[model samples]
Target: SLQPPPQQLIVQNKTIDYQLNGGEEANPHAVKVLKELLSGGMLISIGEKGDKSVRKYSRQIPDHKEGYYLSVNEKEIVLAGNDERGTYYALQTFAQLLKDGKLPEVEIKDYPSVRYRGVVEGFYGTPWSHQARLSQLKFYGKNKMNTYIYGPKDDPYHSAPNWRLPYPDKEAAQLQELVAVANENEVDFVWAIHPGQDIKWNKEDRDLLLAKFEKMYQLGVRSFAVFFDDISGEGTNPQKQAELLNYIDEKFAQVKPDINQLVMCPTEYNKSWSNPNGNYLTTLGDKLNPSIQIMWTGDRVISDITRDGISWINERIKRPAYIWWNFPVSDYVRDHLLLGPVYGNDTTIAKEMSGFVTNPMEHAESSKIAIYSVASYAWNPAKYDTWQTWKDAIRTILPSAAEELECFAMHNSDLGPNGHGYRREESMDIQPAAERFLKAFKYDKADFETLQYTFERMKESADILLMNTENKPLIVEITPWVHQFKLTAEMGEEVLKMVEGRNESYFLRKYNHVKALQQQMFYIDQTSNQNPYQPGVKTATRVIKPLIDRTFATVVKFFNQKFNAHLDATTD
Candidate 1:
C-alpha cells in the first residue's frame, strides 16, 4: 500500500460498506476524510441510524495519547480515537485501505512514533509557488505529517538585505491562507525569518526581527524560526545572536502564550563547529532560554546523521536538537534529482531528536516522492524499510505509472558529489543496460532476438515515462533527463541492429543517428541550467552532464574500433 502500514493490521475475509456517525461533534477534518473515502455514502448523527444493513459504532478513548483503534468485520465497524487529530489520522489510514474504491475488512491500531514530523522548505532556490506550498500542506496532513517550516532561501524577507521589510499585502494574504490551510489540516505552519545577514544585534535590529514575526503572528502563525544559516560574519558574536533569539522568545510569549517552541538555526549548525570542552554551541546552550530549541544539520551540510552523533551533540548542548535533515534535496545539485527513499539514520536518532524536518528539492511536486518516505520514516523509524517505503511512496505518488517511475528513480538515485562542490546522486540506469549490451555484443554470447528484446524494453519504459500524464509536474521537471534516457535507449536498439552485420548504408545511417542523439544529450545538459520550477534562478547541470558525456564517448570509441575496417571498405 502507498500509505504507511499501520502499527497493527489484521486482514479479514470480507469487505464492509461503512457509514460515519457523530457528524454533529466529530471534527470536520476527520469527517472530511470520511466523506471522501466513503464517497458520501452515508452520514448520520450518533444513535440515529436509518439503514439496518449498515453497521456503525464509535467512541472517544480517554488518555489514548494521539492514537486510534479501528475494527472492521462482517457485522459492524467500530472506531475510537483519543482526539480530533487522532480521529483524522485514523480516517487517513482507512482511506489507504480502500482498494478499487472499496474498503477491505480489517482491524487497525495506529499512532505516530515521533511527536513532531514534517518538512522544512529551507533550500536555496526560487521559493515554492503559493499553490505548491498549499498543496504540500494538504499532503502533509494526509500523510500524518504535522509540521511545515517555511524558510525558502531566495525569499528576500526570509533572509537577506530585505529581512526588515514587511511582506506586501498579496504575500501577507497568501501566508494567511497557508496558515489557515495548515491549521485545517492539523499541520503546524512555522514561519521562519533569516535576519542574521544584516541585523546589527542592537535594539533596532531586535525590534525589526520581532516585527517580522509579529506580522506573521497576526496572520495566525504560532510557530516561528530565526535562521542564521548562510549568513557571512554571523559567528563573530554568538552571545549577541543568542540574546536576540531570547528576546524574540520573550516577546512572542508575552503576546501568544500558546506558541510553539522557538526554533533557531545557528550560524554554526553542524558538528564540525563543535568543540570538546566548549564552543559557540555551548555558549548558546548556556545563554539561550531553556525553552528555545536549536536546529542542527548533522556533521556536514549533507552528512549521514547517526544516533551516536546526535547523542554526542545533545550531551554537549544539554538538550534535544531539532534535526534539519538534508536529503533528496537538489538545491546543491540541480542537474540531478534524489528520488531515493529516506535512509542512513536509524530509530535511535528518531528517539533522541526533538523533531525531524527534511530540506526538499526546488521542484515541489517532484519532491513528494522523497518527502513521502520521509513522512513514513519520521512516523515510525523502527518499522521503516528503505526499499518498501520507497516503493510505496512511488506507488502513491505516481499511481498510474509506478513501474515506469521506479525505473527512472533507479537511474537517478546515485548519492554522492556532483563534482561541482555540491553533492548529488548520479543516475546509473543507462550504464547497466549499456554494459549488458556491450558484453553481449563483444562476446557474441547472446542471440540477436534476446539482445533486441532487452533494448526494446528499455526504450518502451522510457517512452511510457516520457508520455506519462499521470504525473505531469514530475514528468515536466525531469523531461530533460528523461529525454536523455530515451535517446540512450534508442541508441542501444540501433547498436543492436548494427551488431547484426547490417548493410554498410544502414550502419552509416544508424551511426550518424547515434551521434545526433549524443548531441541532443549535450543540449539537454546545457539547457538545464535554469530552474524548471522557477525562472531566473541558476541551476547546476554539470552534475549529470559529465556522466552522459563519458557514456557516449565510451560507446562511440567502441563502435569506431569495431567497425573501422568495415567503414573503410564501405567508403571505397
Candidate 2:
C-alpha cells in the first residue's frame, strides 16, 4: 500500500504548517482545522488577501475536493490539502492520533469514505443556537464532515410546532445566521424543510416549501437534504413518493442552481428483517431518487448488523452510504446512562463503505467514549484499535480520573442486559470490580477503603438530603405516590440492582429512594392546600411539609447531577 511512514509526531512538541496547494484559496474552515490541530493555540495560513472565495472554502464536497494532507519532518509537522474541507478533516484525524503524549505513527491517505459525510440537524435540546450549531459544524469540519441536514424540530425560538407551518421570518433569520457561520467555518449547511406529515405534495404546499428554500437561498444555504423521516404517507405509495421527490428536486434546482449534492431519509428501513416492508421501503426510496444519499439507522439493517450491515446496505443502495449509529441515545434511560455494549470489531464496517453519523437522540452521561471510538475508527478504519480508542475517549472526558471510568466501563457486566426495551435491566455487582478500578486510579488498599468510605458518605449525604426531618412533611406524603409510579421509571445505577433482580437490601434501598420522592411530593401537595392563614391542619404534617419538599428536590437533583457528571466525565 502506498502510504506515508507510521511515525508518531508529537503535536505539542511542534507547530503544523497548513497550506492549500494548487493555489486553492484558504478559508475559515481551513483556519479552524489548523487551530484545532494545534490544540486551540493559533493557526496562520498564507494565501492571497481580500479573497471572498475563502468563504466558499467550507466543507462542501463538489465545491471543495482536492483533499488535505498531513506530513511531519524534524522541524515541524506539515498539514496541507487541495481543499479547505480536506484540510479540516485531516485535522480531526490528527487530534485522534495525538492521544496523551503519544502520537500513533501511521500514514493516512484518507477522505470522506462517502461522497457526503455529514449529520442531520438534531432535534433541539442542546444549545442549538446558531453559535452552538456552528460549534458542532466546526467539530464536523475538523472531522471532514461535508454536509449538514437542516431539519429544525421547532421554530427559531424553539417554541413553534415542528411542521405545522412554513419557515417563518425568525427561522429565515436563523438560517442567515447559520449560513454566515457555515461559510465562516467552511461547513456545508444542507437546508431541509419538513413538509409536515408527508411532502404536502399539493401545489400550494410545493410553493410554500420552495419559498422556504428561497429564504435559505437569500441567506446563502445552497446544499440541501430533503428530509422525510416521518413521511410514511409518501413512502406507503410509490406515486406519492415519486411526486414528492420530483417536486423537491425541481424546487431545489429552481431555488439554488449551484446545489448538486442531496441527502434524504425516506421512511424506509425498519426493525424485523423478516418483515418484507424493509425491502419494499428501501426499494421505494431507491426508485424515488437513485442519486440522492440515504440515511440509515441500525434498526433498518440486519439484527446486530454492526460492520456486516454496512456491506449489506452498500450493495443495496448502489449509491454512496451514510450510517447513523444509535450510540449516546442507546446509552441513557430515565435516571442513569449506562455504557452499553460496543458493537462490531472495528469501524471498518462504517469506514470502508461511505459516511458515518452517530445519531444520539438525547445526550447520555457516559457514551462519548463510544463516540470518540466511532470517530477515530471512521477516519482510519483499518489502522485504529477500537478498545484503545474507547480508552482514549475515557481519558478525554475524565482526564486524570480516566482509569476509574475505564474499570467501570470494562467490568460493569450487564452490557445490553436490557435488550431492545426502552429501559434497561437492573444492576450487577460492581463493588468487587470497583476496588480494582479504584486501585488503577492510584488508590492503595487503604486509600481505596478511604475512598469507598467517602463515597458511602456522599451517598449517605444524598440520602439525608432526601429524607431528613427538615424535608419530611413536604417530601414524605408524596413518597408513596412516587412509589406508585415506580414501575414507570427505569432504575438508576445505584437502584437498578434492587429493581430488576432480588437483593432484599438493594430492593429496600431502591424503594426508600422512590418513597422518599413520593413523600416529598405529598408535602408539596399539602402546602398547596394551605391557605394564607389557616393553621388548623395537623402540626406534624405542616412541620414536615417544607422539609420533605426540600429533601425530595435535593435527592432527585443530586442523582440527576451526579449521574450526568459521570457521563460527561466518561465521554471524550
TM-score of each predicted structure versus truth: 0.85, 0.60
What TM-score, to 2 decimals, does candidate 1 have?
0.85
lDDT of 1 at 535: 22
Model 2 gets an lDDT of 0.46
Residue 472, model 2: Cα distance from true site in angstroms: 31
Report residue 302 deviation for candidate 2 (angstroms): 11
| Candidate No. with top lDDT | 1
Q: lDDT of each structure? A: 0.70, 0.46
What are the per-residue Cα lDDT tens digits for candidate 2 across 262-334?
A: 6655555434432454465556446756656666664543223355555556666565455655444422221
Using TM-score, give the best candidate's number: 1
